[PDB]
Amino acid sequence: TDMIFNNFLARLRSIPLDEASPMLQIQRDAATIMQPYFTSNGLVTKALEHAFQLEHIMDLTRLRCLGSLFSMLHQACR
Amino acid sequence: LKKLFRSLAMTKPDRQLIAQVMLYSQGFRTAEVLANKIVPFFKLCDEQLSSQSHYDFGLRALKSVLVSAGNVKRERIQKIKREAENLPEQEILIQSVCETMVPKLVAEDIPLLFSLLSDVFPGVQYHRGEMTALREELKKVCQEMYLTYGDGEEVGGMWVEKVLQLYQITQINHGLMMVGPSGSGKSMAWRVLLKALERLEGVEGVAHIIDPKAISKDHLYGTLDPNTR
Amino acid sequence: TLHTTASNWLHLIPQTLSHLKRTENIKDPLFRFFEREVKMGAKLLQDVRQDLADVVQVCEGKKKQTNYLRTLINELVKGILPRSWSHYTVPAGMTVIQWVSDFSERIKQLQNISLAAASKELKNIHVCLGGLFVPEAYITATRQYVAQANSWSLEELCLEVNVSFGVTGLKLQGATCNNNKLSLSNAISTALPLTQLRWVKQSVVTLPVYLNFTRADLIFTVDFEIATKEDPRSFYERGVAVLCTE
Amino acid sequence: TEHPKINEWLTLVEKEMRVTLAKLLAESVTEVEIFGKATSIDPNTYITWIDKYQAQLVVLSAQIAWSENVETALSSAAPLHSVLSNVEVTLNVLADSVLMEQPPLRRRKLEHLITELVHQRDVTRSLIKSKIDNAKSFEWLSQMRFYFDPKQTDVLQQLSIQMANAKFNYGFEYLGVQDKLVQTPLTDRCYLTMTQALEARLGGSPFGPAGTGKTESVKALGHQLGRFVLVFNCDE
Numbered sequence: 001t002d003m004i005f006n007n008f009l010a011r012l013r014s015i016p017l018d019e020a021s022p023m024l025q026i027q028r029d030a031a032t033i034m035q036p037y038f039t040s041n042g043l044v045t046k047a048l049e050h051a052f053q054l055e056h057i058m059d060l061t062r063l064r065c066l067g068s069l070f071s072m073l074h075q076a077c078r
Numbered sequence: 079l080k081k082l083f084r085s086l087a088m089t090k091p092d093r094q095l096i097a098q099v100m101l102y103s104q105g106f107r108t109a110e111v112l113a114n115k116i117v118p119f120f121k122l123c124d125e126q127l128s129s130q131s132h133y134d135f136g137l138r139a140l141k142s143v144l145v146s147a148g149n150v151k152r153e154r155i156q157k158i159k160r161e162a163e164n165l166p167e168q169e170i171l172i173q174s175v176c177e178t179m180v181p182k183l184v185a186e187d188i189p190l191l192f193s194l195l196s197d198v199f200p201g202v203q204y205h206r207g208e209m210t211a212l213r214e215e216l217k218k219v220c221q222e223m224y225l226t227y228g229d230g231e232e233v234g235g236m237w238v239e240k241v242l243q244l245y246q247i248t249q250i251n252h253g254l255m256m257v258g259p260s261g262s263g264k265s266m267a268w269r270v271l272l273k274a275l276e277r278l279e280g281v282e283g284v285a286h287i288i289d290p291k292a293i294s295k296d297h298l299y300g301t302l303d304p305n306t307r
Numbered sequence: 308t309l310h311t312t313a314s315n316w317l318h319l320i321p322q323t324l325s326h327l328k329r330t331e332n333i334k335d336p337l338f339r340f341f342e343r344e345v346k347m348g349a350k351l352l353q354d355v356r357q358d359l360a361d362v363v364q365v366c367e368g369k370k371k372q373t374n375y376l377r378t379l380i381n382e383l384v385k386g387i388l389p390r391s392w393s394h395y396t397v398p399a400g401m402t403v404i405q406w407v408s409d410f411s412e413r414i415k416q417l418q419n420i421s422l423a424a425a426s427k428e429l430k431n432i433h434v435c436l437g438g439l440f441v442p443e444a445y446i447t448a449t450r451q452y453v454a455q456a457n458s459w460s461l462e463e464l465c466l467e468v469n470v471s472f473g474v475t476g477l478k479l480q481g482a483t484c485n486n487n488k489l490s491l492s493n494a495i496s497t498a499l500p501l502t503q504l505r506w507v508k509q510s511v512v513t514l515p516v517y518l519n520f521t522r523a524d525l526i527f528t529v530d531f532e533i534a535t536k537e538d539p540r541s542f543y544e545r546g547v548a549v550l551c552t553e
Numbered sequence: 554t555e556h557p558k559i560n561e562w563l564t565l566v567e568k569e570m571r572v573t574l575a576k577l578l579a580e581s582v583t584e585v586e587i588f589g590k591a592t593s594i595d596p597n598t599y600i601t602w603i604d605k606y607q608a609q610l611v612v613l614s615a616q617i618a619w620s621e622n623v624e625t626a627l628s629s630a631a632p633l634h635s636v637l638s639n640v641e642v643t644l645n646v647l648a649d650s651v652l653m654e655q656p657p658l659r660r661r662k663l664e665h666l667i668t669e670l671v672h673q674r675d676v677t678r679s680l681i682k683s684k685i686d687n688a689k690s691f692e693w694l695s696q697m698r699f700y701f702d703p704k705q706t707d708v709l710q711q712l713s714i715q716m717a718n719a720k721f722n723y724g725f726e727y728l729g730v731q732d733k734l735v736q737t738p739l740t741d742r743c744y745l746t747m748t749q750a751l752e753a754r755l756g757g758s759p760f761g762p763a764g765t766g767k768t769e770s771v772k773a774l775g776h777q778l779g780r781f782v783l784v785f786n787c788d789e
């Protein structure tokens with residue numbers, strides 16, 4: 001999960017959302033402020049570990065949860 | 079049809095005789111001892127390891143192990159002649175068994191396999207490594223496409239080790255299955271392996287990705303028209 | 308309604324299935340086989356108890372039916388063994404009652420195994436054979452344990468059976484033994500009180516040991532002494548054999 | 554140069570490779586008889602012979618020499634011990650040669666010869682263990698025995714492959730190096746059953762679980778008889 005967090009943070013710091021730039025600078029600042037929560041255990045990993053025993057409708061997969069999270073954070077930067 | 083064919087029941091092949099004669103033909107001073115230690119070893123691993131759907135320890139696996147053992151013995155002989163006579167044949171078989179069985183094993187079965195190896199071959203040991211150029215190219219590609227690289231005990235250590243095991247399987251094998259739960263790094267693993275092999279050996283890599291269940295079998299292999307052949 | 312009767316039998320069922328201890332660092336082959344077998348038995352027990360509790364809640368209580376629960380209830384009412392629980396060999400499709408009885412006996416045996424392991428002492432525990440998930444693995448672990456204990460070769464060990472680890476639940480078929488001497492009998496099956504499995508490096512009638520009456524799953528092979536007037540060809544023609552469960 | 558039709562000159566090529574393999578096998582088995590008349594053999598001239606002939610030809614010539622020698626011994630236990638000692642010293646020189654470093658093609662030929670000579674050694678040891686006097690005993694008739702007749706007017710019909718009540722002719726198809734199979738007793742039983750079925754002009758249907766040796770034993774029998782074996786992967 002920290003590997004996936006590192007991939008998301010790297011792809012946020014580089015490759016700006018528009019297909020240096022002000023948007024890239026905003027992405028870098030957002031990654032800098034979200035780094036402490038993603039790194040180590042932090043909020044996200046403990047949240048996942050608790051949410052695995054909560055009952056869901058569809059079977060829960062950590063990559064589905066993190067894909068939702070990453071898309072929502074890209075929307076926050078936008 | 080049944081009266082037009084003569085049936086023979088093949089269920090139990092002499093694995094011990096097969097291994098002994100084949101190791102003797104490959105060239106091994108202790109061929110009989112190696113066979114008598116390698117066939118009951120596969121029998122032991124058949125039961126005492128955990129039961130999985132992707133596990134197999136049959137005659138195909140045994141023959142793959144023996145052929146790879148002959149190949150690595152020949153390459154070690156070439157290396158020593160570069161730098162013969164008495165050679166660690168038990169270490170050669172251990173290297174072949176590890177290189178062929180270890181990637182297949184679940185994480186809870188590697189200590190069991192190594193305990194069985196220490197039981198059968200006392201002076202066995204192991205030697206894994208010496209892939210520095212491929213490791214450096216893997217690190218370069220992983221840094222290129224926003225992936226994390228590990229040294230074995232770092233964060234990406236298990237993933238990089240599995241990539242190297244995949245490379246070994248591609249080298250000494252014919253067809254491959256990357257079995258794992260959804261989100262285990264299989265696609266990234268083989269993609270960075272293909273790119274790193276392209277960077278090392280210069281030969282361009284082409285990958286065709288086919289989903290066999292998104293199309294019918296007739297669209298996957300082909301059809302014969304019933305009217306005209 | 309069939310639901311009330313199903314709920315009554317359903318409440319009757321799990322009184323023979325309560326809990327299993329999961330029991331873990333030893334290189335003994337016997338302990339290794341026993342720990343993998345007890346972990347798979349604990350997983351099976353948890354699955355079965357969860358299924359039974361789910362059907363109890365859905366029938367004698369308030370719970371919406373799912374597709375899995377509908378399939379399970381249909382299989383339970385039909386009386387066929389559900390495929391979700393058949394994780395070991397069952398003789399020719401036994402009924403749910405027989406399967407539950409056999410499973411409860413196996414769980415009692417595993418509880419005894421866990422008690423003995425907690426107290427190694429696993430060398431001298433008298434252990435059955437039909438109640439094990441994989442008796443072939445038990446015999447292989449037997450051979451490995453004796454080979455490691457005496458420190459000679461595993462591939463050159465013969466088996467001598469005297470009526471050394473205690474195996475119970477075995478039953479002959481068509482013959483009986485009188486002081487390690489087989490005798491032809493007209494009885495269907497004669498029980499075996501005590502069997503020990505000694506290992507020696509190097510007219511004897513050799514017999515199969517099947518898993519059940521189906522004679523489809525051969526486990527291992529025993530050797531016995533013949534009576535003075537009987538014949539090994541007569542034994543082979545009559546098809547005398549040993550079963551792990553009868 | 555005359556430029557016939559492509560199928561015509563391909564048919565000529567096929568017939569030419571068949572007669573070429575027949576002539577090469579004839580001169581090869583002459584060389585093997587010359588070599589194996591003596592007890593001790595020279596590794597240098599043996600290795601030159603290995604490099605001289607093709608892989609299927611050297612394997613089959615060794616088979617012919619062993620079969621003829623053991624049949625001569627059975628016709629007449631001293632000569633049977635002599636042929637066992639000859640097989641054993643051939644195993645010794647083969648083992649020395651494979652322990653020494655060889656080019657890959659020679660190494661493959663040596664591996665095939667070692668497998669075949671191990672099978673011959675085991676059969677001759679069993680034939681010693683049983684008390685066999687005459688050559689008509691079924692304990693010898695069961696084995697696959699090879700007969701070479703140099704007086705045959707046809708080069709393609711010079712070799713006759715025999716089993717227990719089964720006469721076969723070598724197809725003389727160029728097979729490459731292939732891969733010899735370790736002669737399991739199960740493989741010998743398969744050879745007996747399949748040759749009985751072929752003598753009865755039936756088919757052959759080995760069956761069993763996967764990874765047992767069915768397809769490979771069928772292909773090995775086909776390559777032993779020198780036929781072109783095509784494996785078809787059937788489906789619906």
Ligand SMILES: Nc1ncnc2c1ncn2[C@@H]1O[C@H](COP(=O)(O)OP(=O)(O)OP(=O)(O)O)[C@@H](O)[C@H]1O
Binds near residue numbers: 003004258261
């Ligand atoms: N070394 C790595 N470092 C960082 N992130 C990684 C690494 N390897 C994989 N990932 C991330 O893991 C995600 C999972 O995708 P991946 O292609 O690895 O899945 P998979 O194993 O092929 O799964 P599936 O069976 O669902 O196809 C990728 O999108 C990527 O972001």
Ligand SMILES: Nc1ncnc2c1ncn2[C@@H]1O[C@H](COP(=O)(O)OP(=O)(O)O)[C@@H](O)[C@H]1O
Binds near residue numbers: 137762765767
């Ligand atoms: N007598 C033998 N000697 C050497 N190898 C053998 C022998 N019999 C089987 N094998 C090996 O065992 C494997 C079995 O595969 P195969 O026989 O093709 O599968 P199947 O017959 O079940 O379709 C093959 O790789 C083959 O090389």
Ligand SMILES: [Mg+2]
Binds near residue numbers: 264265266
């Ligand atoms: Mg993928």
Ligand SMILES: [Mg+2]
Binds near residue numbers: 768
């Ligand atoms: Mg096949």
